[PDB]
Amino acid sequence: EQSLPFFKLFSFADKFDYLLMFVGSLGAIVHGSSMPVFFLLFGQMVNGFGKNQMDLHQMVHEVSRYSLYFVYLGLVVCFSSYAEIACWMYSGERQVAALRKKYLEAVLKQDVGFFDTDARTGDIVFSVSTDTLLVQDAISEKVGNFIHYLSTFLAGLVVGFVSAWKLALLSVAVIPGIAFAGGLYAYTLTGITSKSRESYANAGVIAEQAIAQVRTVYSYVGESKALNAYSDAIQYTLKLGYKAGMAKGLGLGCTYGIACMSWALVFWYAGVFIRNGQTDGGKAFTAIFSAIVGGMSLGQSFSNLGAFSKGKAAGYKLMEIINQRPTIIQDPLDGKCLDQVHGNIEFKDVTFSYPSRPDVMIFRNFNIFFPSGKTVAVVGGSGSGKSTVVSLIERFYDPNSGQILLDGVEIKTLQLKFLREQIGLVNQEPALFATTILENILYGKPDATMVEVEAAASAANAHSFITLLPKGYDTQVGERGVQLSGGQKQRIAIARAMLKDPKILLLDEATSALDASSESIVQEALDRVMVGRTTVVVAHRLCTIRNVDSIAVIQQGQVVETGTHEELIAKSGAYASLIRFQEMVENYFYRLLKLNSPEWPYSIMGAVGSILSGFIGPTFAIVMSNMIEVFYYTDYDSMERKTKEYVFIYIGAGLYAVGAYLIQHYFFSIMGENLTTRVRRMMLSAILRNEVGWFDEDEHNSSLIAARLATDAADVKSAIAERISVILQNMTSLLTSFIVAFIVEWRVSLLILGTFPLLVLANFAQQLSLKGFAGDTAKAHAKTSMIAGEGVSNIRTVAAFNAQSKILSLFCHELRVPQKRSLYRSQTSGFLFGLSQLALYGSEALILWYGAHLVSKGVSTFSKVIKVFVVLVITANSVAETVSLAPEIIRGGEAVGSVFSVLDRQTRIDPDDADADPVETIRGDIEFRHVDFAYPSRPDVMVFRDFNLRIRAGHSQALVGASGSGKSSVIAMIERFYDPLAGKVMIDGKDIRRLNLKSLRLKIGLVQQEPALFAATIFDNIAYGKDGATESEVIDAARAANAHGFISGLPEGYKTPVGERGVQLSGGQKQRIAIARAVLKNPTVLLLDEATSALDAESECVLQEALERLMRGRTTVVVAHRLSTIRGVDCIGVIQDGRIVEQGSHSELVSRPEGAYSRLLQLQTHRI
């Protein structure tokens, strides 16, 4: 960790931002100290009502003046809350932006050796893209919110203890029980959720391995143990979900009951103090509510400390590269700018080792002379760090031992400003920049005109990707629409190097894109551009090696031989090995509800529970208003009885909550968990039925599919269980509150009726204030972050051409747009929040004024205005949640999109077809008509061109891999992993696509290539090929596979975990189990697949005794790229790029003098 302290994180503050922070803090304190003052004014107006019941002259003036004070308070909140959101959020944008401009400069100042081509560059780009966002959260409006809510607590206590210290002390002493109950509830919820996830880590995870190893499960009957096991696993998750739903019960009910008891106690003490003669009704209420709010605000105040630690750590991580001192210092004074460059580069015993891994040695005793104005090249035997000279010449690593002389002048005695111009680099795949092609050329020389650009393009023939463009000299490679990669690229690096017109040029192995006509074109382009230059070429193939004046061959640390191509080929001096190696190369909601048809009895009893629970708020508000009126009785005798009755009402309501809440939250949880289990079972049953090719897509891999099937499905519950209880409860509370409010008094309730939109909008704004007004801050900064990431990932190219000063000229001019967007967002949010709060506090001063006016005329009476005001305000409070859940109702699929995306997806091949004819017996004949296929992952490949083959019944075939010319593709076409794009597949006198292949695959077996085993013991693993596992043939399988002397010799016997659990066996012995599983099936047709030398065991004691059983009485087809233990007996064919031309036994193939078998003989001799 070693995190930086919270202070000094503002160290990037301008002299103007301090004023912004000061104004923000000053506004925040005032905005936080407002609610208690609102309670004080409300208490004063209640006192004005109470004290003047028999004199309707003073009360009018008091209500008028207090309504005016409410108007003033609303104005203050309007002009204070705006200074908290408009001065803190903006100040959090002028610092992070001012920090990135320094951070990227620091990154681009360091040496290239710091990025040693690994995950370090990924870490740096992740820090740039994501970590600065975390820094921006610790200095944004979160600190303003924290100050706001702490000042609220302080002001509440102050406006508390001063009024009536006893009542405030009671109020602050009763809240610890509620806080402790809430903490216990949260801890229990977290523990139960963790236990549920750990239970989900049980066999409910085996779905991912079944999906990954889908080829083997489709090869056998499968689809039964893969689903029954999943159901048995998810049963436990269902049970723990029931327990979790229970936990969502007693916790909330007990908290509400303790709250109700506390309210009853505090009101009873207020009522016993009021009759003594200490305080008044308008003061005890003020003290109680101020103390309650002050106590409750501290919990929200401390909720912001979570992000502060992350922000501190993020700031510490950033403040590491900033203060780093570069190893190489660019001092213009030390280096004297020279001229008359010649091109003499000479080594003086330059031995260097990488600082990251100094154990290895790279250039032990390195001494080769580079002539001026002459072409030389160095070629290595293999890829043993060949691309190392380029880094050393361009000064990316300081030579620890040795010296490099440039025209007799040491490079270390020169500044790194004008030296880099003399060297041009074209490395392996020089990544272009996602800008216009016009300014890509300008990197060589910032000051250039169009004519030299055209001359450079013509020199490198940069016209086949430029002249015939949709628009002139305008194309963004990063943009998808004009993405013009197209495999090979007309290398613009050639043109940008020619623009410099240097005398030293560097070229790496830039031929790795299926050398073709375009490669030849760029080859003669290069041959044109090497004129009078000290070019150095590194490559592996000998095509470019021939066109070199002098060739240097290195083996390790030093050059083994020099001379020229005609000399190396002579006498085979240190060159026969080189050529030997070279030659060896939406209606969703209705149907979701319909899916819960068997949950009919568990929905009604939850709905009635929600309806019953909906009667909590209005009754509590009614009792509060009634007791508020009761406090002002003249005769003290009836007060005791009324308060006792109301305390009894509170005590009853506590148990009513401890009831109704559990009743609501239990059955709904049951229904949600049942729905999740059903949808998960159906999802797996549908995804396993899908075709093989849909699994091959890069978007659809095992990890993402498992994540969607494991995590996304849970959200379905939140879309059908939690999202329906709250709406019903709030709606019924709203209705039952309006009914009572209208019954009590209607002519005053109409004013509130006309003004619910204002109060609801204001409370919605208050609710949104807790989340933050910034909004999706990553989307705005993604465009800027792309520039930094692309400049860091391509550090090799930007290091040359002196492009460091140019990157921080587009970065600065592009960073300004998010700043303006943030400023506009901040201003709009502040103004709207201020207007909303003014509407809130400006409307409550009208209802009370009209109520007082009505009382003055005698039409209405006290105990009626206050009731309809309090109950209606409290019920308008609840509408905020209903409004907040609105955007996630109509806009379905926001997170719950996988529920029907793959469940209702239509397949092309249905394994179980009722109309398909059943398959009883098969003779075992394989033949293909004129059929070709293309992989669905990338249909551009068209290797198959009119493919045909035949294997007679009761025979064997020995197809050769033929250098991987689609060798592992015929294995996937004999049985229906894929479908023929054209032509017909012929078998057993019937077309393949009219028979029930589920009944057909049970008679055909194959052998896997890459070893893989299920997370289960090997008793049914070898019995997976048949239904019914009896030890009689279990031992027989081990004897046939010859694993009986090995598997049964294990100390723990057969009952042992062999997959990704318990003991992990070697990869060279999993083929024993693989071949043991096949013998149980005893298929009429057998398939083999050996490739990539998966055995790696000389004198195999497995294949020799198993292949003999393999041929006996079976039609076997074998494909392999190795001429070892693949001796055919009936017919052998050779495939060349998706086509065969010769057929017959091994005698015919060996009878050919040379034929196509000579190439296979070459590799056979290579095996030796």
Ligand SMILES: CCN(CC)c1ccc(C(=O)c2ccccc2C(=O)O)c(O)c1
């Ligand atoms: C934030 C949740 N929370 C802290 C644990 C609660 C929850 C409930 C209460 C009740 O006082 C209460 C609030 C409003 C309306 C009625 C009632 C009621 O009396 O049931 C409370 O004070 C605090």
Ligand SMILES: CCN(CC)c1ccc(C(=O)c2ccccc2C(=O)O)c(O)c1
């Ligand atoms: C003066 C009476 N009065 C104006 C009509 C109210 C009453 C209640 C609230 C609630 O916000 C509230 C206050 C404190 C604790 C919990 C809660 C709660 O959420 O139930 C309020 O804002 C204003």
